[PDB]
Design a protein around this nucleic acid. Structure first.
Ligand code: AGS
Ligand code: AGS
Ligand code: ADP
Ligand code: MG
Ligand code: MG
Ligand code: MG
Lengths: 456, 228, 114, 228, 228, 114
DNA sequence: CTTCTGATAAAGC
């Protein structure tokens, strides 16, 4: 490895005095998968890698460098490990509902499929038209606004529009005639924006095309917006935030600049967690994709690289083919296959290699295998290795806390290494189980645990 | 069948009374809490296994968050003993086992840091889901005659000490092999005899069969059978 | 008179029907085990110790068989004097330099137009 | 390999001085598969073979040879390897929509589950009729023209037909009367083509069968065409 | 092998003077499998076996013998080996579509991708009816005419019936009424045979059972038929 | 009286229930190990060191077993005086030629007329 | 004439 290409975070297990470095360029553009049994030290190994990546500064300046790391925290550990970082829990993070790219907007609001037609187009027509109403730029790019375009629309006018078309009344000439405080108006393309207001009364001889057909649809729509689970995305805080401040929040480019961004998704439900993982994975990927094509036309190199750390990837990217894992898997898989070119790579952390999907986990060209006692997990590590050097996998069950085997394109030979101790460790200390059992029967405060459990 | 969860008693009791009942923190305080689910059907056994495991894990999770606010570690650790784990957490990917498997898997995957760990008992290593046994650092093995099970124990060991699995079929009663970070070297041990043992002693077939034809009182058995 | 040249970093996801129609195969370093299993089964020829040979191929090293070459050979393909545009983001080298200012408005304006 | 059939683009790995040729006729006349991992050298290998392919000329002439290679460059990366070659970007490239067959036309315009079956049929009927009207060959092959057959058709005229069918006014005898500047005509197979004009007015005492149904379908089609 | 049974097409590899005969009867009434790699020589082996089997005669006559060999030549290579033989390419060969069975007719026309049952029933019903019309034999085997039976049917009439069933009309009496030059009839199995003509015009009140769901089925059938 | 001759370059893709109905097997140079292992199981007889024999067969060299032959023998099939020749496009011969102009205009008018 | 009810149907899964 070239001397100016060396990135070390560990030393050899057999000889402590020799440090084992990896090709620092090749370590991060080719995806990292770290696996090992429970309590093996994956979180400390991940934190030690990102700590050395933060302090990896070229000579000639003072201040924080160009590292960009996003950590998905489901156990709230790396707040302590990175004190000068930005932590974004669900109660304080705002991800707007107008940043959905259409496919997830289709899935977020509609729990139905295979039969909704009249409920479908009135949903997409309301959103697409409301984006042109609230658009404040030149009209040349107003016409190119579509359902998947990331422009602000009011969801409360969208519900008002669908609840109005619920109450349609046509006239003997077969067109819907409305009436508002300015006067009666035909329901047409240039007059469809007036249905966004609640105070419209229809005048008609007969019921309209969608009269009484969206009463079930509006109730499902209203009883999803006021979910406090989705208050980070569908709440009132997404109203006053814009596209720009969303990106400064995700990669810590705001008033507090940090190389590490941590998202506290610790005790949230899965449906909140699956929305959080799939949104930010797509948003970071498309930011890296679009910043790449800006740099293509400029023919310049001021690109920023982003690494996303996916701890507990079995929660949101498992091998199982369930539909509740579908939207989260596809966002991470897109980063796994195509994300390497645009500057968005992933750090995959899980406790078995055989539970993460093969379309995601086999795209990782570097590997940090800690202790694995499962015969199916060891066979995965053996088959990633040629049979000449496959005998080093025999030491996997004998690995105690701190050692792992690093293989991949970024390292010369696969070696059992000792990951360097974290002087600023994450908050994942092993509980001294017997020493906490020799004490008194301590009176656990049940009231304090319950009234947080209740709000959680 | 669901009277324990959907009965009239669910109205009266509170959240704090339930948590105190499950870990014996009530008026009668005990180190050991036993859930006697002996004759219940699977559909209410899987409900009991999955809900109590979820409640205890989230109690351990929320206790740690309270302790982390005061810059403290978790005060009370909880160990859950899953006896006869093949009934609710098997290798099979059937949909009936899904809720009970996922609750125990959450404890196995994530309960180490939250103070909720598990002791899992079953006949064979191969009849339990691999997700739970892979996370078990300590692995105690009694006599194992099935060759698939013996090779499963063999791969858990390093190859230098892997020859100790050859005494697995000849293991006597109370003779165990203890592995993991707890023990210095994997070794065959003799578990200390229980002065107060579980009431699961083998019944002497020849001693019982040598006596007279017993009347068996079918009315009392059927009366109990019909209640269950 | 219309023939194919199929280049793919994951040969396993290519359909077996179209991949079988190929007659000359250039096999570079194949680290993915499913890519190894797929290629070795569908290769028209074999070489000695091919299981360890495919991961061990160096950069620009190839294994060529087919009916256009008599002996399956390990070949060091000559370097491109005029190389194609290579996308190799040096994450360490870009992370060592100072925190660069991001033109978010330029990126977002192209993102919103898409 | 014969002396005139040799195509050398590589050299032996163990012996650098030895160059390994392939049968150049046999190499390209049968399909080639270049597989490898990421960064193995596939794109440089593809560039090297094609660079040597265009340099294979007979000594008699100067200028371009008869090699014709088309690259589906998904990463916009082969322009540097072949600077003199023609490159077709999205602004540069021009594919006519009418050369798409029936399945490709449907996937371009129509949507999964977002289109009713009657909305789909008027789309298919308009295109398969517009292909016949803009056909300028002999009329013997007009009857064999279908929706799948690729012939030139005006997609804006297709919009006008669909927009007119959205404004249809049915008569008392379940047919549609249409008024044009030439005159009034009942819609049938013989005069369906006069709906491709924009300036056609419907005459009827009642709303047509497809009236008010394709208005949603018009705006989705116009959104597709005017999308830049 | 008896000398009259001998059939020699090869000689021993190690001794060229030893010609290896096979039992020429037994070689051919039991199936032959010639396997090899590409470029091993199995096309030449097939050609040499058949040239040896064509020029073998009783020598009591002058002329062609009784060999009957059919080659499914997919590479167009055996024309050179047998110049005096009959070669049938796409331009020369005519294969009747009505000798196809039901599975082959489904594979030629239907697609398993869409797998629409409603296209499948009308397709089988049209052909099975049309095979009964064009059948000139005795009535006692007309009732066993099926979709799978190898009898002549008109594919343009089948398309015409299928296109007509896309134009069905539903009346207040829930019968389908059609108008023809011969007369006016109801959609009965006796009267369905006059839907095979294109010159019919439907009469009714509302849309029929199969209205609007066969146009994509007609266009794909018409795409196959008018494909050159 | 309707028998069949199977000539395949990938024997391991043939279904086992059809390939086992054949009695006489003319096994030429088999080179893929999957086709070698498939054929060796369903062959009615065996020969000495058939594993190394099959990829080592020379050009026209074959191996015939079955009811027809007495013993499995390595044979040289007789050379075809009138060989089966396929009209194949010589790419490097055509690509070495000058760039052709007259032919492209003739192809388009043929495509348009039919 | 329009409204409402009820029945038939088709769905996707
Ligand atoms: N290099 C190391 N040297 C010594 N102890 C270490 C080292 N790395 C980690 N540890 C210890 O490992 C313990 C548990 O490690 P963790 O990283 O929390 O386990 P884990 O990998 O997160 O497994 P799960 O599935 O998340 S519980 C910590 O309390 C550390 O003290
Ligand atoms: N014949 C060769 N000799 C030496 N180095 C080579 C050779 N071929 C490729 N390389 C090196 O390989 C690097 C990247 O190779 P590429 O061909 O661009 O990657 P690839 O094989 O196409 O994989 P992807 O998935 O397309 S990034 C180049 O920058 C060269 O340094
Ligand atoms: N019995 C034989 N003796 C000598 N040469 C042969 C023999 N059989 C085939 N060949 C040569 O082998 C080449 C392979 O041709 P072919 O039989 O078409 O291959 P394949 O087995 O792939 O069909 C031919 O060019 C021919 O000259
Ligand atoms: Mg962890
Ligand atoms: Mg490339
Ligand atoms: Mg051949």
């Amino acid at each position: 490895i070239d001397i100016n290409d060396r990135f070390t975070f560990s030393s050899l297990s057999l000889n402590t005095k020799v440090s084992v470095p990896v090709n620092g360029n090749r370590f991060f553009n080719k995806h990292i998968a770290i696996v090992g049994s429970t309590g093996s030290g994956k979180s400390h190994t991940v934190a030690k890698i990102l700590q050395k990546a933060v302090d990896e500064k070229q000579e000639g300046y003072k201040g924080l460098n160009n590292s960009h790391i996003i950590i998905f925290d489901i156990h709230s550990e790396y707040e302590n490990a990175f004190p000068n970082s930005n932590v974004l829990n669900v109660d304080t993070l705002t991800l707007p509902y107008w940043l959905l790219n259409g496919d997830e907007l289709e899935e977020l609001f509609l729990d139905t499929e295979a039969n909704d037609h009249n409920q479908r187009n009135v949903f997409r027509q309301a959103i697409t038209l409301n984006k042109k109403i609230h658009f404040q730029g030149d009209p040349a790019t107003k016409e190119i606004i579509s359902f998947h375009s990331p422009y602000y629309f009011d969801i409360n006018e969208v519900i008002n529009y669908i609840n109005n078309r619920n109450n349609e009344r046509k006239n003997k000439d077969n067109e819907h005639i409305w009436s508002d405080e300015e006067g009666n108006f035909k329901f047409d393309n240039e007059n469809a924006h007036r249905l966004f207001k609640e105070n419209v009364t229809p005048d008609g001889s007969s019921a309209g095309a969608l009269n009484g057909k969206l009463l079930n649809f509006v109730d499902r729509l209203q009883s999803k917006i006021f979910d406090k689970r989705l208050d980070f995305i569908l709440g009132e805080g997404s109203k006053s935030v814009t596209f720009k401040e969303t990106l400064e929040t995700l990669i810590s480019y705001g008033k507090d600049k940090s190389n590490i961004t941590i998202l506290d998704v610790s005790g949230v439900p899965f449906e909140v967690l699956s929305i959080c993982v799939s949104l930010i994975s797509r948003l970071i990927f498309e930011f890296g994709y679009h910043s790449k094509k800006i740099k293509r036309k400029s023919n310049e190199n001021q690109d920023i690289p982003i690494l996303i750390v996916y701890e507990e990837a079995h929660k949101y990217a498992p091998k199982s083919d369930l539909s509740k894992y579908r939207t989260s898997k596809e966002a991470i898989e897109r980063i796994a296959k195509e994300g390497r070119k645009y500057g968005v790579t992933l750090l995959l952390a899980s406790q078995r290699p055989s539970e993460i999907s093969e379309t995601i986990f086999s795209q990782c060209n570097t590997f940090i295998s800690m202790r694995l006692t499962n015969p199916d997990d060891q066979n995965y590590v053996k088959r990633l290795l040629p049979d000449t050097v496959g005998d080093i996998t025999n030491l996997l069950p004998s690995l105690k806390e701190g050692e792992a085997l690093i293989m991949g394109d970024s390292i010369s030979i696969p070696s059992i290494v000792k990951i360097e101790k974290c002087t600023i460790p994450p908050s994942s200390i092993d509980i001294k189980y017997l020493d906490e059992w020799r004490k008194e029967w301590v009176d656990s405060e049940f009231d304090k645990i319950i009234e947080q459990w209740s709000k959680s």
